[PDB]
Design a protein around this ligand. Sequence first.
Ligand SMILES: [Cl-]
Length: 150
Amino acid sequence: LNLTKEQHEWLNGWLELWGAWVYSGRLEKRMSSVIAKFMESVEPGRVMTRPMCNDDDGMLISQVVDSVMYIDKKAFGILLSYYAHGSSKHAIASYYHRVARPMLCRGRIQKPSLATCRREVDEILNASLFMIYPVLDSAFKNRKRVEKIK
Ligand SMILES: [Cl-]
């Protein structure tokens, strides 16, 4: 199946705010080893420019995303490259297309090109969002309920 237009737009905005929040260093490293190792692989010093969520929402989204994506560490890395580091899908595709194959974009009768790799990157991100959406929606709805109690 696939998410609807409004569901994708809703989730993408939250993940943009979360990615900016994570990239600023506001997520403590022990919460997610995958996210911790990722932030160690990005050039330091970069300044904040995009808007970010508050610490509560950031923690909630981090817990949801980690609980869903920790099994597919490569998809998790691509999600983080896109949302946290801010790399374009084009840049991610070009990267994985011009590497030394030490998983993604291996190559189908035709030789692997930038177009096929971009397609794979798009599909990985779409599948990730599809898996994340129900968990995040439930987490947000659950917090609201619990927050109302007394
Ligand atoms: Cl920390």
